[PDB]
Structures are given as C-alpha cells and as structure tokens.
Design a protein around this ligand. Structure first.
Ligand SMILES: CCCCCCCCCO[C@@H]1O[C@H](CO)[C@@H](O)[C@H](O)[C@H]1O
Ligand SMILES: CCCCCCCCCO[C@@H]1O[C@H](CO)[C@@H](O)[C@H](O)[C@H]1O
Ligand SMILES: CCCCCCCCCO[C@@H]1O[C@H](CO)[C@@H](O)[C@H](O)[C@H]1O
Ligand SMILES: CCCCCCCCCO[C@@H]1O[C@H](CO)[C@@H](O)[C@H](O)[C@H]1O
Ligand SMILES: CCCCCCCCCO[C@@H]1O[C@H](CO)[C@@H](O)[C@H](O)[C@H]1O
Ligand SMILES: CCCCCCCCCO[C@@H]1O[C@H](CO)[C@@H](O)[C@H](O)[C@H]1O
Ligand SMILES: CCCCCCCCCO[C@@H]1O[C@H](CO)[C@@H](O)[C@H](O)[C@H]1O
Ligand SMILES: CCCCCCCCCO[C@@H]1O[C@H](CO)[C@@H](O)[C@H](O)[C@H]1O
Ligand SMILES: CCCCCCCCCO[C@@H]1O[C@H](CO)[C@@H](O)[C@H](O)[C@H]1O
Ligand SMILES: CCCCCCCCCO[C@@H]1O[C@H](CO)[C@@H](O)[C@H](O)[C@H]1O
Ligand SMILES: CCCCCCCCCO[C@@H]1O[C@H](CO)[C@@H](O)[C@H](O)[C@H]1O
Ligand SMILES: CCCCCCCCCO[C@@H]1O[C@H](CO)[C@@H](O)[C@H](O)[C@H]1O
Ligand SMILES: *C/C=C(C)/C=C/C=C(C)/C=C/C1=C(C)CCCC1(C)C
Ligand SMILES: *C/C=C(C)/C=C/C=C(C)/C=C/C1=C(C)CCCC1(C)C
Lengths: 235, 233
C-alpha cells in the first residue's frame, strides 16, 4: 500500500504505469528513424495505445477517477473510471491497426469501432450496477458486442487481408489470433473477479488486468511494429 | 528509313528512344513521392538504367558515335559505340539492384561489377575485330564472363538473399531468372546476327535488341520497383 490509503493494489497500478511508459518510449525511439510511409502511420497509432494507457494508470494510481458502489451484499466496491476511459480510446486504436492492415472500407471500420465503444461503455454501466442480476445483463450485452467485434475481425477484415500479400496477412492473422485469445480473458476475469463470482480479490485482479493490458498493448505493439507488414508505399 | 539516310533500322532505334524515355519518366513519377528511404535508393539506381539507355538510343538514332569496320571478307560493318557505352554503365546498375536485395558485401559487388565491365568491353573488342577468328575469340571470352556473372547470382547473391525475408528472397529469384533468360539472349543474337553467322539482318537484329533492351530495363525495373521487397531495411 504505497500511498497508504488501504489500497495495496496501487502496487500493481504503479508497475503498470511504468511498464506502459517504457513501452511507449520504446516505440517512439524505434519509430523515430522510420521513413516508410504506412509504417509511420502504424507507429503514430500504436504509440498512443500504451501512451494513453500509462496516463490512465497514473490517474488510477493516485486514485483520481474512482467512485464507490455498495452492493446489495453490503460489501462496497471502488470503481476506476480511468480504466474504462482507457479501454474506450485504446481498444479503438488497436482495432484501427488491424483495419489498416486488412485495408477494409471506411464503413466497416466505423461499425467496428462503434460496437467496440458500445462494449466498453456497457461494461462500465455493469461495473456500476448494484445487483448481480443487473451486472450479468450488462455483461452479456457487452460480451455480445465483443463477439461482434471478433466477428468483423474474423470475416470482413480477414477476407480483406486475404487479398493483401502473404507478409501482411501472416501478421494480421497472428495479431487477430492474439486478440481473439487475449481479449477473451477480460470478460472472464471480470465475471469471476470482484464484479461476479469473487474467486479473486481486488488485488490479484488488478494484477491480472495489468498483465493483460500490457500484453495487449506493449506485446501486441511489439509484434506489429517489428514486422514488414506495416511497410507500405502502395500502388 | 526515318532519317532517310539509307538505314531503316532507325525506325527501331526511335521507338526504343521513346519507350526508354517513357519508362524513365514513369519510374520518376512513381518514385518521387515514396518516403521509404531504402526504397528511394532502388528507385534512384533504376531510373538511371532506362535513362542512360534513352540517351544512348537517341545518339544511335542520329547516327552519333558510329564507326566502320571492314572485315577480312570484304564486308564492312557499322559499330555503334553508344550501344556498348549504354551496357557498360547500365548492366552494373542492374547488378547493383540485385546486390542490394541480396545484401552481399562490397567486395563481392566489386568483383561482380568488375566482371560485368569485362564482359561488355571484350564484347566491344570483338565487334571492332577484323577477322572471324578475332571476333569469335572475344565473343567467347565475353560470354565466359557472362557465365561468371550468372554464377555469382545463382550462388553467392542467391545464398545471401535466402538469408532475408520471403518477400525479398522471392523478388530476387524472380529477377535473377529474368536475367538468366533475357541476358542469355544477347550473346546468342550477336553470334547469329550481322556480327556472327549473319542469319539475321541488321533490321531484325536491331528490332530484337530493342525488345531485349526495353524488357531488361523497363520490364526488369517495373518488376522490382512495384515489389514490397524494396521496402524497409
Ligand atoms: C526516451 C526516448 C525518446 C526518443 C529518443 C529519440 C530517438 C533517437 C533514435 O535515433 C534515430 O536513429 C535513426 C536510425 O535508426 C536515424 O536515421 C535518426 O536520425 C536517429 O535520430
Ligand atoms: C454478474 C455476472 C455473473 C456472475 C454471477 C456470479 C454469482 C453470483 C454472486 O453473487 C454475489 O453478489 C454480491 C453482491 O450482490 C457480492 O457482494 C458477492 O460477493 C457475490 O458472490
Ligand atoms: C448488443 C450489441 C449489438 C451490436 C449491433 C451492431 C450492428 C452493427 C451493424 O452493422 C451493419 O449492418 C448492415 C445490415 O443491417 C450491413 O449492410 C452493414 O454492412 C454492417 O456494417
Ligand atoms: C571509361 C570509359 C568511358 C567511355 C565513355 C563513352 C562516351 C561515349 C563517347 O562516344 C564517342 O562519340 C564520338 C562522336 O560524338 C565518336 O567520334 C567517338 O569515337 C566515340 O567514342
Ligand atoms: C588490357 C588489354 C586489352 C587488349 C585489347 C585487344 C586489342 C587487340 C587489337 O588488335 C588490332 O586490331 C586492329 C583492328 O581494329 C588490327 O588492324 C590490328 O592488326 C590488330 O592487331
Ligand atoms: C578457344 C578460343 C576459340 C576461338 C574459336 C573461334 C574460331 C573462329 C573460326 O576461325 C576460322 O577457322 C577456319 C578453320 O576451321 C579458318 O580456315 C579460317 O581462316 C578462320 O577464320
Ligand atoms: C574454358 C572454356 C573454353 C571454351 C571452349 C570453346 C572451344 C571452341 C572451339 O571451336 C573450334 O574452332 C575451330 C576453328 O578455329 C573449328 O575447326 C572447330 O571445329 C571448333 O570446335
Ligand atoms: C551463355 C549462352 C551461350 C550460348 C552459346 C550458344 C552459341 C550457339 C552458336 O552457334 C550458332 O547457332 C545458330 C542457331 O541457333 C546456327 O544457325 C549457327 O550456324 C551456329 O554457329
Ligand atoms: C532465349 C530464348 C529466345 C527465344 C526467341 C524466340 C523467337 C521466335 C520468333 O518467332 C517468329 O514469329 C513471327 C510471327 O509473330 C513469324 O512470322 C516468324 O516467322 C517467327 O520466326
Ligand atoms: C567459339 C566461338 C564459336 C563461334 C561460332 C560461330 C560460327 C558462325 C559461322 O560463321 C559464318 O558462317 C556462314 C555460313 O553458314 C558464313 O556465310 C559467314 O560469313 C560466317 O561468318
Ligand atoms: C523471353 C524470350 C524473349 C524473346 C525475344 C525475341 C525478340 C523479339 C522477336 O524478334 C524477331 O522477330 C522476327 C519477326 O518479326 C522473326 O522473324 C525473328 O526470327 C525474331 O528474332
Ligand atoms: C517480352 C515479350 C516479347 C514478345 C515479342 C513480341 C514481337 C512482336 C512483333 O510484332 C511485329 O511483327 C512483324 C512480323 O511478323 C514485323 O514486320 C513488325 O515490324 C513487328 O512489330
Ligand atoms: C488495452 C486494453 C484492452 C485491449 C482491453 C480489452 C478489454 C475488453 C476486450 C473488455 C471486454 C469486456 C466484456 C466483453 C464484458 C465484461 C466487461 C469488459 C469491459 C471487461
Ligand atoms: C540494358 C542492357 C542489358 C541488360 C545488356 C546486356 C548485355 C549482355 C548480357 C551482353 C552480352 C554479350 C556477350 C556475352 C558476348 C557478345 C557481345 C555482348 C556484349 C552482346
């Protein structure tokens, strides 16, 4: 409990702040010398991901955007708004990388980000719900939007990426498989965590999310920005 | 006979001038806005191939730089110095594109370019020769140097390029095959043309060299420049 406010999870919120900074700085340092046209677009977008994330973690660290929601079980919970505002801007940027990688139309991209934004906001509403029946409704509403995200990713984007070269479609697939597995752990951890079953306390959960967040931002970013697939001057 | 100067092959040299110029401009236009630093290097090198050829083809059109050679048989021939000047500076540049893709070292490049220059120079010495024995001796030597170039591509360069990404490796192999088929045609066209057995007249020979030159420069250049293999470093 670094800030001595009863929340020993700030331990994780801190490491996450740093780790996200390091990833951000690493991407910038590495993108500094890139001249390739399209490659520079991917960097700009991806740099913002851990960038925005480290700023949301610093806030959660100082416990800047948290409120309480006393459940019906008498046990009150503290909800971090920054976490959701983070995912609200970050997940759309990661999806953009994939959209750019697949070369899909602007209409499909708008729908993609839309359902994705709907996923985070509903997940927010649920977290803020008092009864376990309400939290499941909002959770189902959110997991559905997520399945839709996965759907446009595994059909539209993928079939469009299929038309690109092997180099590009090989990375799209890799990153789309990563997203499919990695992102699926969020609804799970959420429902088994403090918002659902409670098999995990506020501590370990915060640590698990941080590990997922970093892998989904710095790890994803590393695999993408490190490949030739972002290279492009087109036709 | 465009210049109406008793030589109708000018019809093929004029067309070659245009296609060489057109290709040079398409390459500049397509590369001007490319920011990929490494891709900009391939463009610079390549633009000069049809560029230098354009000039060489214009010179030959107006009959600049030509010299007569009376064979021992009595027959006399016109030797367009400009053709060998073109090749002398052009084949090395094409070879450089390949060296770049493969990422071979500077020494290899050096012996590669050196052997290519020998090939052109000895070929020109054959063209200026007075006897079939002298002409075919240099032709043979020049052809052996060609085989040396071919050997470097199929072994050293090809080996080094295999160490690179699939995309790079793929484009290198395609272009190397293109050289193996296109370049092989020059010695053959020379030996069966007015410089050799004389089965083909000066008119067709020029038509054939024009086709070969444009494919080997603009064609080759197009395949390279539109590939993802010149991206990144
Ligand atoms: C906290 C870290 C902040 C980022 C630091 C600035 C990044 C410096 C990276 O060096 C760059 O390397 C390129 C070649 O790779 C050169 O072409 C370029 O000119 C040079 O500037
Ligand atoms: C909502 C998503 C579906 C998950 C359902 C998990 C099983 C039901 C858990 O109910 C209980 O609810 C209380 C608040 O009402 C909590 O204080 C208590 O720890 C929790 O055990
Ligand atoms: C609970 C979460 C609900 C999420 C609902 C998301 C709906 C997204 C709409 O997509 C659009 O549907 C059109 C047909 O109606 C298609 O012609 C168009 O191409 C497609 O982009
Ligand atoms: C390293 C060697 C580089 C050589 C460069 C070749 C330049 C081309 C010059 O061609 C010259 O054109 C003259 C007519 O204008 C002819 O009278 C002369 O005989 C002929 O040679
Ligand atoms: C670095 C070494 C380069 C060697 C190049 C070979 C040059 C051979 C020149 O032969 C000469 O050709 C003349 C016609 O052009 C003949 O009239 C003359 O009788 C004959 O002797
Ligand atoms: C290893 C180098 C080999 C070079 C071979 C080139 C041979 C060119 C043909 O020459 C000709 O041979 C005839 C006899 O067969 C002579 O009667 C004739 O006068 C002579 O001009
Ligand atoms: C190290 C590689 C060497 C390449 C060898 C090429 C040898 C070419 C020999 O040509 C010979 O020319 C004679 C006239 O001069 C003809 O009478 C004879 O029938 C013909 O066969
Ligand atoms: C690096 C590739 C080297 C290829 C060498 C092959 C040389 C073949 C030259 O022989 C010629 O073949 C013509 C038919 O094609 C005949 O009409 C002609 O009388 C004969 O002299
Ligand atoms: C390195 C391999 C090079 C292979 C070159 C093959 C050239 C074939 C040219 O065929 C020509 O087609 C004309 C119709 O288009 C006919 O009128 C003409 O009589 C016929 O000779
Ligand atoms: C090792 C190098 C081998 C080169 C072989 C090329 C041989 C070319 C054959 O000579 C040509 O034969 C014609 C008749 O068929 C003659 O009309 C012509 O005047 C003569 O030049
Ligand atoms: C990849 C293989 C490329 C082969 C290119 C060959 C050059 C183009 C054709 O030139 C000439 O056309 C004449 C008809 O117009 C034919 O009678 C003559 O025999 C042929 O030589
Ligand atoms: C790289 C691919 C090369 C493919 C070869 C294409 C050869 C096209 C020849 O066309 C025409 O043939 C007539 C004779 O039939 C000539 O009288 C006429 O002048 C010529 O223009
Ligand atoms: C950098 C952060 C990332 C990639 C966050 C991803 C978050 C999700 C995929 C969240 C999904 C959720 C549901 C499907 C329902 C339950 C609530 C959420 C918000 C955890
Ligand atoms: C743009 C022009 C190119 C790629 C020219 C290539 C020329 C050759 C490979 C020439 C080879 C020759 C011999 C092997 C011997 C006979 C004389 C030459 C110069 C025609």
């Amino acid at each position: 409990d670094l800030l001595n406010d009863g929340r020993p999870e700030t331990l994780w919120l801190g490491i996450g702040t740093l780790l996200m900074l390091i990833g951000t700085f690493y991407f910038i340092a590495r993108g500094w010398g890139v001249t390739d046209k399209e490659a520079r677009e991917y960097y700009a977008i991806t740099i913002l991901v851990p960038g925005i994330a480290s700023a949301a973690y610093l806030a959660m660290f100082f416990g800047i955007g948290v409120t309480e929601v006393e459940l019906a079980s008498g046990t009150v919970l503290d909800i971090y708004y920054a976490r959701y505002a983070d995912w609200l801007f970050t997940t759309p940027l990661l999806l953009l990388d994939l959209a750019l990688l697949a070369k899909v139309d602007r209409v499909t991209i708008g729908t993609l980000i839309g359902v994705d934004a709907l996923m985070i906001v509903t997940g927010l509403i649920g977290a803020l719900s008092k009864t376990p029946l309400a939290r499941y409704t909002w959770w189902l509403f959110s997991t559905i939007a997520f399945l839709f995200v996965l759907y446009y990713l595994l059909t539209s984007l993928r079939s469009a990426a299929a038309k690109r070269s092997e180099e590009v479609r090989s990375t799209f697939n890799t990153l789309t498989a990563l997203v499919a597995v990695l992102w699926t752990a969020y609804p799970i951890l959420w429902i088994v965590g403090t918002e659902g079953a409670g098999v995990v306390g506020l501590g370990i959960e915060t640590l698990a999310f941080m590990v997922l967040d970093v892998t989904a931002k710095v790890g994803f970013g590393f695999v993408l920005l490190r490949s030739r697939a972002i290279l492009g001057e087109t036709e």
